[PDB]
Each structure stands twice: as structure tokens, then as C-alpha cells.
Design a protein around this ligand. Structure first.
Ligand SMILES: Nc1nc2c(c(=O)[nH]1)N[C@H]1C(S)=C(S)[C@@H](COP(=O)(O)OP(=O)(O)OC[C@H]3O[C@@H](n4cnc5c(=O)[nH]c(N)nc54)[C@H](O)[C@@H]3O)O[C@H]1N2
Ligand SMILES: Nc1nc2c(c(=O)[nH]1)N[C@H]1C(S)=C(S)[C@@H](COP(=O)(O)OP(=O)(O)OC[C@H]3O[C@@H](n4cnc5c(=O)[nH]c(N)nc54)[C@H](O)[C@@H]3O)O[C@H]1N2
Ligand code: F3S
Ligand code: FES
Ligand SMILES: [Ca+2]
Ligand SMILES: [Ca+2]
Ligand SMILES: [Hg+2]
Ligand SMILES: [Hg+2]
Ligand SMILES: [Hg+2]
Ligand SMILES: [Mo+4]
Ligand SMILES: [O]
Lengths: 822, 133
């Protein structure tokens, strides 16, 4: 309304890391009885702010959306207020539009979270009904046991989160990982954002450089920052705002000069490698001026040619660190030969003028007058990770970075900007083959498929072929269940199993909401998010924090690691009763009562005496971390790896990796790799040769992922009723479409729809459509093409556009004004 | 009472406003800067004979920096973290970090006198516990 209820001076306050993106901004959650409130005097409210007169600008981040009233299981009502933590070094009090909505997205029976799953849901042949947890487990474990018994693990499929933050985290990745890999032991597992059990960073890791190798403070110390296939203002907001912008503004120069007394520090500059002119480029120009920003608007998919050209040039100029190369690397001479490309050929391929390539290299690699090489931080994200051959692009980029010693020096690093937070602790993947899960399902394999904390109907590449196949296979199982009457659970398990021998697939979804998966699912289990449970995760500089529980989950919703334990124990008991002792033993190790038990069993046991093989981002010193120690550390947490712990110093961590040149390889040296330039993959080139528009796709600053909460928010639905597609104005004029019209976007892979958004900055023949949304799924037009490790070129597709008509209500209510600040 | 007591503050008469030329005024007190503008073309909720006069609080709802009106786009722009609001769509946030649209100052247009009067606010003005302190 037109007022807010302030938290009382003695209100309960707990720490909460943002549920959403990688930055991991720190927040506080204030909780107090509904009928109580703080006073306006500063010492009479928990914010410590004086509300007796107008507050000055930047004094607070507080709106009604940052407040809510929750109802606990005991029926007691409590005001909550979720606001950023001014003292957290990550965000220094900043809140993005996504994390600012956290209070609104907490569960309440009447608010935006009204439709949260709060009980097991079953599609009982021809209708959705509630069912009990015991029944859901007897059915689910029943189908898994029958499949293991008759087909083995190859018949049990999963697509599961492997990330941090909400819907992820060290407790949850361990629970699900132990269940899929150690207990069920199935290799038929894909990850939430890629169709196989693989890494987004195979090349950099094999070269010896883990992708999160620096601190956000390094962005403050850099002479030059590169943002490659990345739109940080919109996708890693507060890292860009609290660390990158102060450097461009000159607010960090004295820090640089203080650390390095005999080194020149010119005004900081920034270079964007992105085919598209984004809000991040616009803001960088507004802040630093045009002359301090280079936008390398490369032809889509030409990153490898760009980096091979830059690498060739700095080697020819001698703008490399020869002593570092000779002492700490292997493979340089071979890389010089294999990656040779002139600046003229580089320019011809990328479309970037030779002068701009030379300027980017001079700003970045030519020695400063005082002698030292510039400190150049090379940040990258999905424009290359989901780019034209993930493995090859990274090989090319890291060669340039290694040769110029831009890892291990403060103010540098070659790092992923990140998506979700990270929070990975799991047993090793139980297989030696790379398996394209969506293709196996489309071809008819598997008896049961579980989507866990993800929604590939909206996010898989070649999503239309996936939805077509899953809906059809699901229908076969429904039709078979329709014939039954009075069937016990055991008889239904056989009925469903037999249907799967006839083309069917039993589908389960473990999630916060029904989602579009409900159009095919036969069973849905309710999960709990941070605040309804404790949860640990780390951000883009490896800073691990504990988000504290402060309220009850809706109904019987449960932490994911505890759902995994419930499933494991249901299967153990079934095998015990069937007299299969060896099989039952596979399901031991899940006697957990709370998520902290999963933290102790996974993260804290990595590398310890008697522990099994565990792959953990916490490494072997993870045991030094405990919930109590994290809580004492506050939202600042500790940067991993933890070096030590004692009562007097608390947890002590690591700011930057590779500062001594000891890389993560056999010989401790960084390894150069060849990067052949092959042009666009034939699958993508065929669409490009047949269709008119490059169908770039990605993030919008206000929308979070598949809009699972945003779909219920009235302001979000008013602003973005449909997925939009940015189009060049001359292209729009030619096709007679303008803001608010709806178009069909299509190619050989699929057909989808979007509302047109004319954007002056978009190049002719190019477009950009919001990905993974609830109204107009972009992925239907992405191809099935993936690199050698099955990493999709999501950003590589072309298609045609057909006008449907004018959506009068969108024209009346949606702004189509510029989202680029200028 | 469940409602706040908003003052009735004279802004100007409608015929004195020039198309797309913003008028600065404070409401509901001198610590709350606002802008009224006759847009030139009707918008839902605009008042006056052409249903095009609207007004807003200009303090950014993210962290309170004063926003500036851009006549060429008919938007209000915040220089702190780059949020921009649409004056033609009731303060709809076009792009930005705020979680609320720009607060709308409710105007009454009186045909008998031609007067425009600010009489309420829809949305909560930055930096205060209630719109009326
Ligand atoms: N075309 C195209 N496609 C893309 C991309 C692209 O750039 N272009 N990006 C890819 C990338 S980087 C990603 S990350 C993927 C994302 O693909 P998905 O992972 O499918 O999308 P999310 O919205 O992150 O899915 C999270 C789901 O988990 C649920 N959920 C939330 N919290 C919890 C929780 O605590 N527990 C459980 N069990 N469920 C929870 C949410 O309701 C939601 O359904 O999409 C990929 N697809
Ligand atoms: N607002 C918001 N923030 C998010 C998310 C969200 O849903 N909403 N999701 C989070 C997640 S899971 C992820 S993965 C990150 C993603 O963060 P980003 O990767 O930064 O975002 P994207 O929009 O997917 O793509 C980045 C840029 O890649 C460019 N690009 C396209 N093709 C190419 C190419 O061939 N080469 C190059 N060099 N660039 C290319 C696009 O023009 C785009 O601007 O964002 C995270 N943060
Ligand atoms: S508020 Fe949340 S969405 Fe990212 S920029 Fe900060 S972690
Ligand atoms: S104060 Fe306006 S965008 Fe942050
Ligand atoms: Ca389709
Ligand atoms: Ca503008
Ligand atoms: Hg990578
Ligand atoms: Hg147009
Ligand atoms: Hg913007
Ligand atoms: Mo991602
Ligand atoms: O991601």
C-alpha cells in the first residue's frame, strides 16, 4: 500500500544469501509477530534508520515487495522483511531487482507463492489428485526397483540441478548425487542446463585453470576488463555495479597505487566481445565515455578466430610474458603454429576492423611505461560457453590469457562470470561414456525419467523435439493406467512398467511448482527453498555462506537432500523385504533428519579418512567449515579453499588461485591447446543458409530463468506478458511489425512465438529473444548440435519470422521503450 | 481511519502546461519532489481535456536517487544504477533494479476552474515509512 510496517528494534534477524544469481549478494531476514512493529526513531526499529523525516538517497533499499506476512505450521503469522546487508563485501548493501523480490517469493497461502507444491501430486490416469508421501514413494521406488531388477540402472533417467543457491547447494547436490550415483548407480543422468553429464569448462580445467580463479576485488584492481559473451549488468548485476563500475569511475585507483607503488595505472578500460550491443555496453560507455570502451561486435560464432588473431598478434609483437611461459607452461610453440591467423584474416572472419583488434591488444597486453604488463581480467559467460564449439573457443581464449600471464596476478584472472551460485559435492559420475540424454529419451529409451529442480520443457536445446516425444510417451502410460480398477500400488507398478515396454515413460518432477512439466508428469513432489531450510553455497569468487532457515515450508514440502534420503530409504526397505541384501546395502547412508546431515556427510567428509570418492568444490579442507562457523562469519563467509580455522581467527580462506604458478595439471604448469577455426557447425550453417535471422537468445535483467516465481507476479506479468524478440527497426519496418505485434519464429527444428520489441541497437538480420520463458519458449528453434563433450551451441541458430498480428492489449499496457541507458 | 491524510495541493491550471514541458513541484511535503507533464497524446489515467497530464514522484524506488525526465523518450532516468521508468505507462519500469513502478501522483482536473490538484499517491515514495510523514 502506501506504508510499510517497520521491524521492531528486537526483531529476529537471520542471514540469507540471495536465492538467485552467482553474485550471491548478502541479505538479512527480519521476522517478527504480525501485530507488532518498530518505531520511526532510529533506535526503535531494527534497520537503525530515522523514519521521522525523509531519508537521504542511497540510505536504504526498502519497498513493499521486500516485505511479506508468512503463516507458520502452527498457524502463527509473522511479518518478514528481506533486505540487503550493507556490510557484506560482495554487494555492499545493493539488491538487484531479482533478489529484491525475495520476500514476495517466500511462500504464503495468499501471495505470489500460493501455488507452491505442498503435497505429492499424482496424475491418476485421467486427473491430477493429491496423494500421500508413502504412496508416492511406494510407486516411485517401486518402479525404480522393478527397472533395476529387470533392466539395470540404464532404465532409470534423471535431469538434475548441479548448481548452488536455491534449488541447489552443497546439501542438495550431495543428496541427489549420492542417490543417483552411489545408490541407484545410473549413468543416465543429464544436468539442468546441458544434456549430458559433462562440464561447461573441460578445456580450461584440462589446461590447469579452474574457472573461478580470482576475487571480485580483482575487478577493482584491473587496468582492463574483458566481458566475453556476457551481459553483466543484466546477468551478474551487483558484481558489475559494486566492483566493475567503481574501477571505471576511478574510485579504486588509490587502492591500485597503494598495492603497487612503482606501477603506472591508466584510467581503466573495458572491452566487450558480443555480436549484440547490450545494456552493459551502453552503461560502460555512459560511465567511462566512448573512448574507454571497445565493443568488438563480432560475427556470431567467430570467437575462436578473434582469439587466434589476438594471440598471433601479441606473440608477433612480443607482448607476452616470456619468463612466465618458460617457467610455468607447456605447449606454447605448438599453439603459435596451430593457432596462427593474421589480423587481416581475423578481421575478415569476425567483421571487426583491424584497427580495433590492434587497439584491444594495445590496451590489454602492451607493457605499461613503468614496465609491467597491464592487469587484464578476462571474464566470460554463455555467449562462448554455449557458443560455437565450447571446447575450441576456450582453448583459444586461455592460450591468449596464459601467454600474457593474465591468471594469478592481482587485477587479472580468466573466469566464468557464472550463472547460478555454485554448491557442488558429489560422488564421481558412474560411467565412462558421454550420453546425450534428450536424444536417448526421444529415441525411446528409459522406463522412468525424473526432472529434479529443472524444467527442460522450457530450457532444453531442440526443445520442441523433446516436448513432442515426452508428451507422447507420457500419454502411453496414462492410457495404460486408465484401464485399471482397484489396483494396489504393486499392481499399478506392473501396469506402468508394461506400458514402458510399449513406448511409454513414467515421468516425475521434484520442484517448487507444477510448471509446464505438469502437462506430462505422472508424479510431482514438493521441495523447499532457502529460508524454509538451511543451505550452503558459494558465489563467483568461491565465497561460501550459510542461508539460515527462518520459516516453515508449505504443507509437506521438503529439502531436496531429504527427498533423496526418503527415496533411498524406501528402496533400501523394499530390497531388504525382498531378501536382496547386496542391493539394499547400496542404499545405506541416508539416515538423515535435517539438511545439515547432508552437509556433514558430503562436503565435510571430502578427502577424509575412510570416506568414499567425493568430488567437492570445498576440497579436502571442507571439514573445517560447519554451520556454526559460517554463521559467525556472517554474509562475508569465507573464500574457498579454507586454509585454516581456529577460535581466534575464525575461518581463513584464499583470495586468488594460481598466484605461484602451480596449476591444476600433471606437471603443475598451464597447458596451451590448439584451437582450429572450423566455421559454423554444418547443422547450424544449414539453418543459416535457409533462413533469414540469427536467433540470438538469453537473459533479461528483470526475469529470473524459467520465471517459476515471476509467472505469478502481477508487475512481471504486466511488463512481460510474453517472451519478446528484439529486432532491428529496418527489419521490423520491412516485415510491417512493431512493438506489441506477435510473430511466429521458426526453422527446421521448431516453431515458437514472441512479441516484437523494436531495438535500434540490433543489427540487420539479427534478433535477440528472451530464453526459457512461460509464454513463447525460445528453445524450440535451437538445434540439436553439441560440441565434443555434448555442450550445445544454444546461441547458434537461424530462422524466419512471420507476423501473426497486433496484440492490442500489449500495445496498451507494455512499454517497448529502450532498455539501453543513454 | 485506514487511510493516510493526503493534502490537496494546487499544481497549476491545465492550460498553462506546455506539451512535454515538465513542471516541478513537491507533494505531499517539501521533502518529496515530483514532476507533472502534459504528454501531448492520451494515456490511460492521464487527466485534463486530452487525458494526457500525469505526475510522479521523481525519487527512484530502488535507492532514492532523483530521476530526470527525458523529453525525447518521455521517461524518467536514474543515474545511480540505471533504472528507467515509462511516463506513458504509469511509471512502468522499462529496465532496472527497482521492485516497484515509479509512484503516481493522483491529480484531480476541475473543468470549472481549469485547476490541476495533487490529491494522493499510488505507490510508496522512496525513503519513508508512509507517504505522509
Ligand atoms: N536457448 C537457450 N536455452 C538455454 C539457455 C540459453 O542461454 N539459451 N541457458 C541454459 C542455462 S545457462 C541454464 S542455467 C538452463 C536453465 O534450465 P532449468 O534449470 O531448466 O531452468 P531453471 O528455471 O533454473 O529451473 C529451476 C526449476 O527448479 C524449480 N526449483 C526452484 N527452486 C527449487 C528447489 O529448491 N528445489 C527444487 N527441487 N526445485 C526448485 C523451479 O520452479 C524451476 O522449475 O537453461 C539452459 N537453456
Ligand atoms: N537477470 C537474470 N540474470 C541471470 C539469469 C537470469 O535468468 N536472469 N540466469 C543466470 C544464469 S543460469 C546464467 S547461465 C547467466 C548468463 O549470463 P550471460 O551469459 O551473461 O547472459 P546471456 O544473455 O545468456 O548471454 C550473454 C551474451 O552472449 C552473447 N552472444 C550470443 N552469441 C554469442 C557468440 O557467438 N559469441 C559471443 N562472444 N557472445 C555471444 C549475447 O548477445 C548475450 O549478450 O546469467 C545468470 N544471471
Ligand atoms: S541480488 Fe541476487 S540476483 Fe544476483 S546480483 Fe545479487 S545475487
Ligand atoms: S537508485 Fe535508481 S537505479 Fe538504483
Ligand atoms: Ca513449438
Ligand atoms: Ca534513451
Ligand atoms: Hg569454462
Ligand atoms: Hg518496426
Ligand atoms: Hg537497462
Ligand atoms: Mo546457467
Ligand atoms: O548456468
Amino acid at each position: 500500500n502506501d506504508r510499510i510496517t517497520l521491524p521492531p528494534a528486537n526483531a529476529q534477524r537471520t542471514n540469507m544469501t540471495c536465492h538467485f544469481c552467482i553474485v550471491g549478494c548478502g541479505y538479512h531476514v527480519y521476522k517478527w509477530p504480525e501485530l507488532e512493529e518498530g518505531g520511526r526513531a532510529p533506535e526503535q526499529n531494527a534497520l537503525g534508520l530515522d523514519f521521522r523525516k525523509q531519508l537521504p538517497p542511497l540510505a536504504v533499499t526498502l519497498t513493499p515487495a521486500m516485505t511479506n506476512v508468512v503463516t507458520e505450521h502452527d498457524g502463527a503469522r509473522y511479518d518478514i522483511m528481506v533486505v540487503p546487508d550493507k556490510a557484506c563485501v560482495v554487494n555492499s548493501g545493493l539488491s538487484s531487482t531479482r533478489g529484491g523480490k525475495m520476500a514476495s517469493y517466500m511462500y504464503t497461502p495468499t501471495g505470489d507463492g500460493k501455488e507452491r507444491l505442498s503435497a505429492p501430486r499424482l496424475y491418476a490416469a485421467d486427473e491430477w489428485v493429491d496423494t500421500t508421501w508413502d504412496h508416492a514413494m511406494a510407486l516411485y521406488a517401486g518402479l525404480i526397483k522393478k527397472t533395476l531388477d529387470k533392466d539395470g540402472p540404464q532404465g532409470v533417467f534423471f535431469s538434475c540441478f548441479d548448481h548452488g543457491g536455491a534449488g541447489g547447494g552443497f546439501e542438495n547436490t550431495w543428496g541427489t548425487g549420492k542417490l543417483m550415483f552411489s545408490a541407484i548407480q545410473t549413468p543416465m543422468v543429464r544436468i539442468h542446463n546441458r544434456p549430458a553429464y559433462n562440464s561447461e569448462c573441460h578445456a580450461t580445467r584440462e589446461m590447469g585453470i579452474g574457472e573461478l580463479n580470482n576475487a571480485y576485488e580483482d575487478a577493482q584492481l584491473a587496468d582492463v576488463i574483458w566481458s566475453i559473451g556476457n551481459n553483466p549488468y543484466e546477468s551478474q548485476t551487483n558484481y558489475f555495479l559494486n566492483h566493475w563500475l567503481p574501477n571505471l569511475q576511478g574510485a579504486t585507483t588509490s587502492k591500485k597505487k597503494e598495492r603497487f607503488p612503482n606501477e603506472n595505472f591508466p584510467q581503466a578500460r573495458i572491452i566487450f566481445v558480443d555480436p549484440r550491443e547490450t545494456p552493459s555496453v551502453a552503461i560502460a560507455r555512459h560511465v567511462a565515455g566512448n573512448d574507454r570502451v571497445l565493443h568488438l561486435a563480432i560475427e556470431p560464432g567467430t570467437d575462436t578466430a578473434l582469439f587466434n588473431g589476438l594471440f598471433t598478434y601479441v606473440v608477433e609483437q612480443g607482448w607476452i610474458d616470456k619468463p612466465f611461459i618458460e617457467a610455468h607452461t607447456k605447449g606454447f610453440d605448438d599453439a603459435v603454429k596451430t593457432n596462427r591467423l593474421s589480423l587481416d584474416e581475423c578481421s575478415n572472419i569476425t567483421g571487426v576492423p583491424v584497427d580495433m583488434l590492434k587497439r584491444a591488444a594495445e590496451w590489454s597486453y602492451k607493457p605499461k611505461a613503468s614496465g609491467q604488463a597491464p592487469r587484464t581480467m578476462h571474464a566470460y559467460e554463455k555467449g562462448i560457453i554455449w557458443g560455437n564449439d565450447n571446447y575450441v573457443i576456450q582453448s583459444a581464449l586461455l592460450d591468449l590469457v596464459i601467454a600474457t600471464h593474465n591468471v594469478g596476478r592481482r587485477g587479472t584472472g580468466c573466469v566464468r562470470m557464472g550463472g547460478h551460485q555454485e554448491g557442488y559435492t558429489r560422488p564421481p559420475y558412474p560411467g565412462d561414456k558421454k550420453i546425450y540424454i534428450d536424444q536417448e529419451l526421444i529415441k525411446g529409451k528409459g522406463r522412468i525419467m525424473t526432472w529434479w529442480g529443472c524444467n527442460n520443457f522450457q530450457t532444453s536445446n531442440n526443445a520442441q523435439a523433446l516436448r513432442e516425444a515426452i508428451l507422447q510417451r507420457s500419454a502411453i502410460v496414462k492410457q495404460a493406467m486408465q484401464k485399471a480398477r482397484g489396483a494396489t500400488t504393486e499392481e499399478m507398478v506392473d501396469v506402468i512398467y508394461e506400458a514402458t515396454q510399449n513406448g511409454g515413460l513414467f515421468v516425475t518432477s521434484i520442484n517448487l511448482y507444477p510448471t509446464k512439466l505438469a502437462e506430462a508428469a505422472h508424479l510431482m513432489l514438493p521441495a523447499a527453498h532457502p529460508g524454509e531450510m538451511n543451505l550452503t553455497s558459494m558465489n563467483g569468487e568461491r565465497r561460501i555462506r550459510l542461508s539460515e532457515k527462518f520459516m516453515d515450508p508449505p504443507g509437506t514440502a521438503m529439502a531436496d537432500c531429504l527427498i533423496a534420503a526418503r527415496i533411498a530409504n524406501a528402496l533400501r526397505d523394499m530390497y531388504q523385504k525382498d531378501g536382496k541384501a547386496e542391493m539394499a546395502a547400496q542404499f545405506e547412508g541416508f539416515d538423515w533428519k535435517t539438511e545439515e546431515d547432508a552437509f556433514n556427510d558430503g562436503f565435510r567428509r571430502a578427502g577424509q579418512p575412510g570416506a568414499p570418492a567425493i568430488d567437492s568444490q570445498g576440497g579436502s579442507t571442507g571439514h573445517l567449515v560447519t554451520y556454526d562457523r559460517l554463521r559467525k562469519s556472517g554474509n562475508n563467509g569465507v573464500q574457498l579453499p579454507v586454509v585454516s580455522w581456529d577460535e581466534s581467527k575464525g575461518l581463513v580462506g584464499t583470495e586468488m588461485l594460481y598466484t605461484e604458478g602451480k596449476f591444476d595439471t600433471d606437471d603443475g604448469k598451464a597447458h596451451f591447446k590448439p584451437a582450429p577455426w572450423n566455421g559454423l557447425p554444418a547443422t547450424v550453417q544449414q539453418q543459416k543458409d535457409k533462413y533469414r535471422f540469427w536467433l540470438n537468445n538469453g537473459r533479461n535483467n528483470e526475469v529470473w530463468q524459467t520465471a517459476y516465481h515471476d509467472q505469478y507476479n502481477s508487475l512481471m506479468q504486466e511488463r512481460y506478458p510474453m517472451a519478446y524478440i528484439e529486432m532491428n527497426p529496418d527489419d521490423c519496418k520491412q516485415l510491417d511489425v512493431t512493438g506489441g505485434d506477435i510473430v511466429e519464429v521458426y526453422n527446421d527444428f521448431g516453431s515458437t512465438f514472441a512479441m516484437v520489441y523494436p531495438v535500434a541497437e540490433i543489427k540487420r538480420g539479427q534478433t535477440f529473444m528472451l530464453f526459457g520463458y512461460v509464454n513463447g519458449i525460445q528453445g524450440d528453434v535451437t538445434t540439436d548440435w553439441t560440441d565434443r563433450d555434448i555442450i550445445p551451441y544454444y546461441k547458434g541458430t537461424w530462422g524466419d519470422i512471420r507476423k501473426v498480428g497486433s496484440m492490442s492489449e500489449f500495445k496498451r499496457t507494455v512499454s517497448f521503450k529502450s532498455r539501453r541507458f543513454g | 481511519r485506514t487511510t493516510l491524510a493526503y493534502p490537496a495541493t494546487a499544481v497549476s491550471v491545465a492550460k498553462n502546461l506546455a506539451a512535454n514541458e515538465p513542471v516541478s513541484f513537491t507533494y505531499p511535503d517539501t521533502s518529496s519532489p515530483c514532476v507533472a507533464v502534459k504528454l501531448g497524446a492520451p494515456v490511460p489515467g492521464g487527466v485534463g481535456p486530452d487525458d494526457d497530464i500525469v505526475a510522479y514522484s521523481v525519487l527512484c524506488t530502488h535507492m532514492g536517487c532523483p530521476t530526470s525526465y527525458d523529453s525525447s523518450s518521455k521517461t524518467f532516468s536514474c543515474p545511480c544504477h540505471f533504472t528507467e521508468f515509462d511516463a506513458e505507462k504509469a511509471g512502468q519500469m522499462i529496465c532496472g533494479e527497482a521492485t516497484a513502478d515509479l509512484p503516481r501522483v493522483l491529480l484531480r482536473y476541475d473543468a470549472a476552474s481549469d485547476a490541476l490538484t495533487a490529491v494522493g499517491v499510488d505507490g510508496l515514495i522512496y525513503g519513508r515509512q508512509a507517504n505522509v510523514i
